[PDB]
Amino acid sequence: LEVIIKAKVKPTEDKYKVKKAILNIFPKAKLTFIEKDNEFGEWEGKTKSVEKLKELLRSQSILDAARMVLEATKFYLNKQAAYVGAVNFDGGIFVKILADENEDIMKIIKDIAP
Amino acid sequence: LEVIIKAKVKPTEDKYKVKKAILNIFPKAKLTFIEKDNEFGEWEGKTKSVEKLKELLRSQSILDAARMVLEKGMTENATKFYLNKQAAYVGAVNFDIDTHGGIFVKILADENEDIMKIIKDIAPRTKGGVIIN
């Protein structure tokens, strides 16, 4: 498992509130911020742990909802929900879980969203 | 004339940056911040001056766009439209709602003002980028 995280930071945003939103869901992520033109910016991170995510889908009873969005895999989490510690699917936090050559993404999907 | 302004502040936004985006377009606005749910908030305020807005439309040379947007949101004694919050942050006027909500603007004409005259005054027609009346 390798998790690729990307989040944009608009001029009116607090880069660190965005960072916190990410970590709330992927606490293990190694994140770096890239500056851009006209006050825009972005966070690019990576992590190998989907534990907090799993813990939230369960603790929030949305395993099936997640299962559906997941079916490597890429999806978007709602930044504002992630900020208050919640997992939500409806730019957002770009997430891409990619199973190494010797794994099946589906099996990863079932371990994450039973 | 009277301008009503409302701008949401999302959880990951810095309320002071949203407030400055408003002031960059409406310098005289009196603003108040109210808290909502799940870390959301909102700025509300008013001003009787559209002087800065008028300068920016001329400076950016986007009178033609402004005129169309103002007429489209026009009613009997008012007109409304949104401003891009990110463009506003850097001192620019843009009418597309940004990913974060934009700034909702309502210009109200008083009983002795004609709303269409307010609009012609703010965003006058042009012929070659040069104002008419």
Author numbering:
A (entry chain C): 2 to 72, 79 to 97, 102 to 125
B (entry chain A): 2 to 134
Show the paper's wording.
For 10077a from M. jannaschii, full-length constructs with either N- or C-terminal His6 affinity tags failed to yield crystals. C-terminal truncation of 30 amino acids yielded diffraction quality crystals and a structure. The polypeptide chains of 10077a and 10077b extend beyond the C-terminal helix, α5, for about 20 residues, and form a type IV turn followed by random coil. Pairwise sequence identities among the structures we report herein range between 15–22%, with exception of 10077a and 10077b, which are 35% identical. Our four UPF0201 structures represent subfamilies N149845 (10077a, b) and N130963 (10077c, d). The crystallographic asymmetric units contain one protomer in 10077c, two in 10077b and four protomers in both 10077a and 10077d. While 10077a, 10077b and 10077d all form one type of dimer (typeI), 10077c forms altogether different dimer via crystallographic symmetry (typeII). The interface surface area for type I dimers in 10077a, 10077b and 10077d are 672, 563 and 611 Å2, respectively. In type I the turn connecting β1 and helix α2 (residues Thr13-Asp15) assemble closely to form a two stranded β-sheet. Interestingly, structure alignment shows residues (Thr13, Glu14, Asp15, and Lys18 of 10077a) near the interface of type I assembly are strictly conserved while those seen at the type II assembly are not.
UPF0201 family proteins constitute one such uncharacterized, archaeal specific protein family. The UPF0201 family proteins occur as a single globular α/β domain with approximate dimensions of 55×35×35 Å3. The protomeric structure consists of a five-stranded, anti-parallel β-sheet, five α helices, which are located on one face of the β-sheet, and three loops connecting helices and strands. We have further documented that all members of this archaeal specific protein family share a common polypeptide chain fold, which is evolutionarily related to the RRM motif found in the ribosomal L5 proteins and many other RNA-binding proteins.
